[PDB]
Design a protein around this ligand. Sequence first.
Ligand SMILES: Nc1ncnc2c1ncn2[C@@H]1O[C@H](COP(=O)(O)OP(=O)(O)O)[C@@H](O)[C@H]1O
Ligand code: BEF
Length: 763
Amino acid sequence: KPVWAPHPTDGFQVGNIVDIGPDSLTIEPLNQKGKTFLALINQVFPAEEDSKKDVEDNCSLMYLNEATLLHNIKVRYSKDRIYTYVANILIAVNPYFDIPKIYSSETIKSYQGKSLGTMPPHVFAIADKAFRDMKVLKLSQSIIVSGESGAGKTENTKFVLRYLTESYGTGQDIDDRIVEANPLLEAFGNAKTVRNNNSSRFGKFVEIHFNEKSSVVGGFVSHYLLEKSRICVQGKEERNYHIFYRLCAGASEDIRERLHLSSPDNFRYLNRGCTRYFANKETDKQILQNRKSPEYLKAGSLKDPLLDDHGDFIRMCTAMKKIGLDDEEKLDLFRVVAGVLHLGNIDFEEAGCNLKNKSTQALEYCAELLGLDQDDLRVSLTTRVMLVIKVPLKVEQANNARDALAKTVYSHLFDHVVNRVNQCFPFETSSYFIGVLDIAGFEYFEHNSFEQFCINYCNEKLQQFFNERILKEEQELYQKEGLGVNEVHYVDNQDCIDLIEARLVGILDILDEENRLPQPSDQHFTSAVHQKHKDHFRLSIPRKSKLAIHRNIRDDEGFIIRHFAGAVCYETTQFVEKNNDALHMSLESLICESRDKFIRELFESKQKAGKLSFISVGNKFKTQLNLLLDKLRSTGASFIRCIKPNLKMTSHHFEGAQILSQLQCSGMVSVLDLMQGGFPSRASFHELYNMYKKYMPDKLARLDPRLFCKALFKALGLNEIDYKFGLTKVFFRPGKFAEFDQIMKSDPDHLAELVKRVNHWLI
Ligand SMILES: Nc1ncnc2c1ncn2[C@@H]1O[C@H](COP(=O)(O)OP(=O)(O)O)[C@@H](O)[C@H]1O
Ligand code: BEF
């Protein structure tokens, strides 16, 4: 009798059907009771008989649907079971606290060489299946860890890497380096955002390479889209990259004086954001008074279970030593970091413009740390080279020259760090790899800019990949075998991908075209997108938004993209500026020709006077992404769907509607609809024949694999609908292969008797 009917905060609630109607159902919520509400036919789902129980694999449910999945993972989460399967897919709900011993060395050991279902659901089982499939099928593998900001992608990527190196490594401390390199990338590429204290402001693909003997030979890290806007200004509850705070909180008084550092409130590149440190009662005592901002003294420390700006600086130094990064290179990194900070403190005033007299120290400190002549820096920030004529810049143009230099220097430093990490675990050759993808998922905010557009473009391509691998190939296998399964259709998003990335006509090339025009304009670009794609299904003017908050945005000030997971309204202001990775020739020449070898080497691995300096961020990213998707399409794939349980970073706080929405946007409803009608467990006639012939009377082996299976299945008295004979394999319905392997373990005399009852000639 019980069903699942909608609920605004829980997603679903338990109810009973009291009246069925042509277009809606009448639900009486459980133990209310006189209260009744109307729900759509397609929003009411059958519920499990036992509401207390849970299944490790959602395919084991009596009814597999979004409401039964949501309940199952809710019950598990309340019992600190954050991992649940959906056939070969893993659902990982962020616990927001440390679940004891569940990632221990003993735990790693217990998951080694064990098939899915042998052990409880775990990120370690997904990693082991990847290593085992790689070893047996002699084909590279990829693990895609997806989810919203704060979902746990980065933490689960670490668990995968740590499991694989600690389980299939050589034993020597060289295996630790793939793990020990993460605090280093996180110091430079992670930052405090409102949705995640340790947010990754870059995407990564971490490959672990192996030989023919399937043993780690090294690794390789591909980094994507480091956020540049974060380097100069942040919102008041957000911070710059972790390194800035780890250095101000942890650097010795010797490093502090040498790099001319102080409390974060003294730097423009930090003081618009949150200037507080992550500390506890113990670590606050370790931070000197000259490091603490007035905001920190007034409001105290920021709280997090793991981040500690003082302790993280110590762990980062340890990580640097452990991966082979000497003290000289350590200080070189810090020098460039402080060089960016001091650059930010340079102020300009109307003359044409010039440096403020109060900016004298900042110019001095920045030029010394970046290896530049002060006058060269002063001239390169307040003028500009045109067709040759030094045109004086206005105060706002100087601010932009300053910040563009900062963003370039920091982005190049991050490339150095990524590449340095890759040199610390190199390999001559490899047979296969296990790649782990950790990149930002689809998201919308009140304001979406070029950064979100790029992330959402990337997600459009990864969703297409997931849809093909999980829905398209699986249904093609059912049709090829002639199983006559109900077709589950998904919306093909190729037209959305094309809209963004096609050459000449795509939005990324229309943006590039704008950057190459004599007077580039965000509005001219936006009108060109709307004019070219006026009749496109995936594009709209902001006026046509379903959300009232976007209706005032002019046609030339934005656009809507109907992404796979939903419509996103973009404000196109600063799209032209954000699409350009290049510096004006004067600034590029200035920094490439630094006195300091390390700074020059940041730009090692020529523009004419009146020539345009332009490097397309969009098309550099399209290229990197097309390479990544060549790698992913070449490999076997596994999917880890991470779920953010709430908007408060709190433990044991399951927000049903928010979770349902994440499962819905990731396309899991189509997966459940496919599974509920599909056959996830399968085996060839020869595979079943070779594995189970020994258990049966001898005469059964004389039969060909197909007919051996036909005879066995008749002897066992298996439900005709529980399995389906295909052209080359037996397809087992959700959780019906387990029932078969169960009886096959039964007494051989009873198996012989079962055969005798259906064909005594086979005795
Ligand atoms: N399994 C886990 N165990 C403990 N804490 C976790 C776990 N997964 C995530 N967290 C917590 O949630 C935070 C956000 O997770 P994170 O991996 O950074 O998210 P994402 O990379 O998806 O943005 C982490 O900093 C940590 O506090
Ligand atoms: F905060 Be997530 F790593 F994008």
